[PDB]
Design a protein around this nucleic acid. Sequence first.
DNA 1: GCGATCGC
DNA 2: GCGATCGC
Length: 66
Amino acid sequence: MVKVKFKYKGEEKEVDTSKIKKVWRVGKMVSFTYDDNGKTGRGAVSEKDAPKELLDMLARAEREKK
DNA sequence: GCGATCGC
DNA sequence: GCGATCGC
């Protein structure tokens, strides 16, 4: 169980990596979308605060050749 | 301004 | 179509 904790719209949050859908990099920012009980949530963390699991997922997304 | 998306 | 949003 790996939970990513982040702030969005001032709201503190925590999402389970298995709920994370897309992950991408924007500079040093790791951004993603996730299943938020029915809707698509958005969140991002600094690469430094990203657990290895999230970086693992980012590396996998970065290898996508479609 | 970068990526990408949601919610207008 | 675009602002807000996230870290920097």
